[PDB]
Design a protein around this nucleic acid. Sequence first.
RNA 1: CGAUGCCGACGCUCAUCAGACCCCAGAAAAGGUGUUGGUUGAUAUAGACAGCAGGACGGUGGCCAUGGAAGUCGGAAUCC
RNA 2: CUUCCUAUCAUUGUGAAGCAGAAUUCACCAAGCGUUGGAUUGUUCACCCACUAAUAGGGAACGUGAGCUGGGUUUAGACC
Lengths: 52, 131, 156, 190, 99, 198
Amino acid sequence: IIEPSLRQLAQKYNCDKMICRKCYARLHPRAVNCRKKKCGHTNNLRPKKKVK
Amino acid sequence: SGAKFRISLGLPVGAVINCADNTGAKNLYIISVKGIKGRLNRLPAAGVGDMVMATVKKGKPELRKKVHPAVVIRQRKSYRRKDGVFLYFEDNAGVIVNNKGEMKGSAITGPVAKECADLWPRIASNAGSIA
Amino acid sequence: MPPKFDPNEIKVVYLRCTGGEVGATSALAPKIGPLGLSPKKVGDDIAKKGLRITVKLTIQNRQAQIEVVPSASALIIKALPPRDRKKQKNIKHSGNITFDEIVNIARQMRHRSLARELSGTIKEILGTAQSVGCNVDGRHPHDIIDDINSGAVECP
Amino acid sequence: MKTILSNQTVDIPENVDISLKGRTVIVKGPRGTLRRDFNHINVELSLLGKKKKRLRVDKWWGNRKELATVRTICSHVQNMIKGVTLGFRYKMRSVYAHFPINVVIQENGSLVEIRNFLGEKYIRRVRMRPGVACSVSQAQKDELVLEGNDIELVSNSAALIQQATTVKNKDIRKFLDGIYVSEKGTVQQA
Amino acid sequence: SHRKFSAPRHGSLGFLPRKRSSRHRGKVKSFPKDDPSKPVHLTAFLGYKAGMTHIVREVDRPGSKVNKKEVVEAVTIVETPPMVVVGIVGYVETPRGLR
Amino acid sequence: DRATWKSNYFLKIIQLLDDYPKCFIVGADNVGSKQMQQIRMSLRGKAVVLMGKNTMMRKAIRGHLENNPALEKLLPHIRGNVGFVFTKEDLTEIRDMLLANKVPAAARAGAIAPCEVTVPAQNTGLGPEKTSFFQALGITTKISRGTIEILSDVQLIKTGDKVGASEATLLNMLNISPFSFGLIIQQVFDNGSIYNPE
RNA sequence: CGAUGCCGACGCUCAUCAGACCCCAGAAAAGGUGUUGGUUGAUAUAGACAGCAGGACGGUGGCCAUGGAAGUCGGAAUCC
RNA sequence: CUUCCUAUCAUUGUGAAGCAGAAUUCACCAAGCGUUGGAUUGUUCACCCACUAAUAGGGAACGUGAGCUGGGUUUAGACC
Ligand SMILES: [Zn+2]
């Protein structure tokens, strides 16, 4: 059984992320440049798609 | 548990083994053992108690000319138990079966190797004598 | 009420649409009612122009669906040759439904929103709460946003 | 480029004495002592005033990447001030939707066994960093508490037991369970 | 071209000065590591291989299809008369190696 | 800031002082967007409310130029967010009707809590819901006498404690706040004759 | 490998694939709040950008589309 | 029969979904380890039956004739 607060606490670590469209990294939610040098710090970012 | 300790595989692809049930077949023509990954240039071999695909070459016209799963009951190659007795029957044998693991006929003639009766309980139900 | 009429203080209100004709929501009165043991039967009684959508606040004091059409003027202006689809009537009126005096009644009964000076500020609201002809003929609010002092003390 | 000076001052409380052998700041408070080595970082540290009122860091002739460490030296000391006077508590909650997380503290402050996670039969044991003590919260039904006088060892040792319970080969946005940090306070706060 | 059909290799290259041994007896190349908690004891012995023979025993592996049954198992017989100590040698660690 | 926005800010506040005879210094402390809407909805029946970010600063440049004199007696008193209300009302009506409302506005995430609330073991209003949101942090509450009754009575609410995203939400439906200031007045401007509320 | 074993001048660059000299055997369109310069428009004591201080407000699921759209296929519309 | 490559079919570690689980598709470090038995054709290629974790692609003078085979090209005999 999961509770209201806990779920939004869990969603902080697994569900509110930014993803880099060129290398599929998992960025922190307020980033506009990727982190890895294997795509060139690209700024093509999209939110990690939230479930149905 | 699920132990099936190695028994000397003695029927390579091409073996023609007498059918042993009442489905009306008389010869199973092994095409490929089931579960063997093999090596470059090595015929798959089917031991005793190993599901093996087979095409009846002489019998009921209904059965002939299609691929039926089979199980090898008695093999002629002397195989070892895990107590040092080398049991080997008089002829190759087999029986048609569904891929769900249960017989098509309902009357097996001759003995059945104890290796099979431990593996396919459906066969061990109809076995005349588990030799 | 929602699961099994739980022991609580249900006085639920919801924002419901499509009065009159069913629309494509395929429902008129309830949004959370039927699963709460509070029937939509009496909400259908109020459901029976405007052939079109509204916004409905519905009140459920633990057993009774007393559906109230809100006293917002736009919800009542419209309700008072077939009014067919794909209009595009510029804007929704016939041009002679007396816009300047439908909004007299609204100004005197709408007292639950939109900070009011003397009633020259409620008239700004309830002419802009409208979407039938958008502040009689098509001049939209463009420089009418200072009359809260120069037409409010001269509103009555 | 080539900034002639950018400095920073660390006002330290009066209950604390800090000594430094060049670049090895040793801070001591009500809860113990902490030693940190700032080597290969090239900042000159000074200390002014009676009772050691203020620590002053310094940095001469520093370009951009070599300049941004003057504050980092300052910022860690604050955590070495706070960590020794107050002392850190990192509250962390166990989310479970399958069936219970069975965490038991096998020893004083280590071997935090985590049974029945997602139904697994594996006993995921984790050993905390030295000097970080783990206790199962008497205050709430499902929380651990990590107390320690150093943020790097306290915070890291929390990331382990959080990371040591990771769902694999499943929709992460659906299997929301594990152990996740919640609150980051101090031992005595207000 | 490439090999038409893939295949595993023959033999093992990890054994590849394939030639006669210089020794005649085994030369244990690395003794077990000493855990100095244990009381002192020898590590290796020197035996002679006589032949082979059968054996029969029970077996109690839980879950095996052979549990609590007889098994026959080919064995050797390494005749091992007691040795005789005659000499002592001391080794010192050197950055080059052992001396 | 802009220029037209700045000149409009000059234009809006300068007219409202002339439009209504006098203007009161009422404390417009931290309060919700719609919660302070009602502050403008309550106080306007014959009055104008105005919150200024840079309109309120012209008091300095006006005070030097001695229009509506002596604003230097009132310039550095605006530490904290107090505000002006352009009314034809009087000194006691502005004070009491803004005291009377006592808006229980919704708080912010990640704030601090200098102000405290006692947490008794009775019912204050908790409609159809589950106690699980309280059961998140170990508080278990029963359901009796209508609303959910929080049986805990200890001072759960202290000074300076950290408020999480869900923490302000709980106090919202209980309609209690750690910032219970309301609207406060102690300074009056009356046509050059500076006063305090009478 | 004969010659800087000048206490050579001013700078730029971190590469988990650095770069290193005519013909020459050292690849591009495109990217990078990596870093160091430049050009242009702004804003700051009618005081900045942050952060603390409140949030996507309400008439309102406006009216409609009915294509289901309370911020969404899509609508002359689309304000207070 | 040996080795090598990666632009990876399967295996170890991981990232993303219009990803509930099962199966899956896009991608990253990655060549350690595997990538089969057969009917027909001289066949490389192709198409099929069967099993399998998958039946991925290639190079080394289009590897390899003082290693073999000589089936087909491609001498001389012949027939259409
Ligand atoms: Zn990236």
